[PDB]
Amino acid sequence: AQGLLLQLLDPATRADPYPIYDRIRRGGPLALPEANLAVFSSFSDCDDVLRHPSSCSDRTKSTIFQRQLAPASFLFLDPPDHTRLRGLVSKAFAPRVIKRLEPEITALVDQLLDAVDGPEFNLIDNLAYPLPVAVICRLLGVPIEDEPKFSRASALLAAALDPFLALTGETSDLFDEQMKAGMWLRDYLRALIDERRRTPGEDLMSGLVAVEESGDQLTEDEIIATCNLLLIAGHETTVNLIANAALAMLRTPGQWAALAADGSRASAVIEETMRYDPPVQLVSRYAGDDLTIGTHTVPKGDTMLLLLAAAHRDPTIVGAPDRFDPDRAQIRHLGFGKGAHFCLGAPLARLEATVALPALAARFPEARLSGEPEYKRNLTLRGMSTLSIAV
Numbered sequence: 001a002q003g004l005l006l007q008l009l010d011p012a013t014r015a016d017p018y019p020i021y022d023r024i025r026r027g028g029p030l031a032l033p034e035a036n037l038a039v040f041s042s043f044s045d046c047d048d049v050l051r052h053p054s055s056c057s058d059r060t061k062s063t064i065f066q067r068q069l070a071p072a073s074f075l076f077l078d079p080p081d082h083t084r085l086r087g088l089v090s091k092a093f094a095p096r097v098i099k100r101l102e103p104e105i106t107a108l109v110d111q112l113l114d115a116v117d118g119p120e121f122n123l124i125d126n127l128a129y130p131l132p133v134a135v136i137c138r139l140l141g142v143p144i145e146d147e148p149k150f151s152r153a154s155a156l157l158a159a160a161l162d163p164f165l166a167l168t169g170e171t172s173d174l175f176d177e178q179m180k181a182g183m184w185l186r187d188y189l190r191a192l193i194d195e196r197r198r199t200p201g202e203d204l205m206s207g208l209v210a211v212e213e214s215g216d217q218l219t220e221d222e223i224i225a226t227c228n229l230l231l232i233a234g235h236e237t238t239v240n241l242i243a244n245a246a247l248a249m250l251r252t253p254g255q256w257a258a259l260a261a262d263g264s265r266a267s268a269v270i271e272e273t274m275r276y277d278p279p280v281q282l283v284s285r286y287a288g289d290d291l292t293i294g295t296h297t298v299p300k301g302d303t304m305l306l307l308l309a310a311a312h313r314d315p316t317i318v319g320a321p322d323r324f325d326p327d328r329a330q331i332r333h334l335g336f337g338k339g340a341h342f343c344l345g346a347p348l349a350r351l352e353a354t355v356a357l358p359a360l361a362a363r364f365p366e367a368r369l370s371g372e373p374e375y376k377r378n379l380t381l382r383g384m385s386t387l388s389i390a391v
């Protein structure tokens, strides 16, 4: 029960957490009020929490956080601040604006594929990781030559999304390092923001400074928090959509060959990967008031963990849920969330993967998995450090 949750955090289960997720879902919703916790795993319950007007994303409303104690980016804020801050960047991430990036993405993918040397290569280092990094750095106005340092700080803050406090009552062993990385990143971005008051940029950071300096809609601290969020999302997400999709195709009869032969399968491959092997495995909410999900009540202040990975494999929603099937009639997932905090990066992530995947398959139609992949320790933003492909 609580043993199953700790098995999820155990690194030994990272390569295949799905038996555990499925077992938890079969058992039903987990009400653990003595741990100030509730764990939802059905599609219905996760959907309901994401939409519930009393579900909060601000940690200040959390009993666990208030006890641990004894601005955050808008991912972790509620209205009105969430509404205002998301509103300020949503146009920048709209499909119409993101579509303009297709030539840059295509040139990057081609360059990266050109540089691949056989007979074996790590998809992570050679493609899945560097593509999204180049794009987000350009978008935000962060110099690509500073990437070595972003990468390490970014990796640490991605890891910080693991629900150690909720599941174990203690902070991560990485806590001190993560605070240091957070401070470094804020200071770093502050300096980039300050130079944009002197030299005109053509990037999102500059656009945000223009608004901040014109009125009361935005503070410098908020620009820092927003850009930090965007930079990290750009480093720590799409990489896993690409790599998880590659892995699922390599493991599933005919799938790599089918995409190599027909790039139009890319969209279905991507959405079925979001369902079957989600880059973001779980999200957290806090009950802003006593609330009901299905027949279960969650006390005000308790953490609600939503195991999206389990929800995507709910047999009441999808047939053969544990099969990777890009040809299935209905692909339904919550891999980009739902409602107020729905992923702002979804058009960009989709575009990045839509260009990358069919190009990869077409370039190496005879590709096979070489050995078994190695996983990072991360639970929430779960991904491979090594995915070896023999060409």
Ligand code: HEM
Pocket: 057, 074, 075, 076, 086, 136, 229, 230, 231, 233, 234, 237, 238, 241, 278, 279, 280, 283, 284, 334, 335, 336, 337, 338, 340, 341, 342, 343, 344, 345, 346, 348, 349
């Ligand atoms: C496949 C890649 C991605 C996945 C799977 C993913 C997943 C998610 C999920 C599940 C959420 C909702 C979290 C919640 O409800 O608490 C979210 C929110 C968010 N995502 Fe993504 N994301 C991806 C790529 C990106 C990219 C590339 C960016 C931009 C660089 C981005 C920017 C954001 C932002 C700003 C939010 C917060 C939205 C809000 O709070 O209003 N994402 N994402």
Ligand SMILES: CCCCCCCCCCCC
Pocket: 073, 075, 157, 158, 161, 228, 229, 232, 233, 236, 237, 280, 282, 283, 284, 380
């Ligand atoms: C500051 C960390 C932001 C990285 C999150 C990227 C978007 C994915 C949402 C994950 C929510 C648990």
Ligand SMILES: [K+]
Pocket: 212, 213, 214, 215, 216, 217, 218, 219, 220
């Ligand atoms: K201001």
Ligand code: NA
Pocket: 083, 086, 087, 088, 090
């Ligand atoms: Na908006």
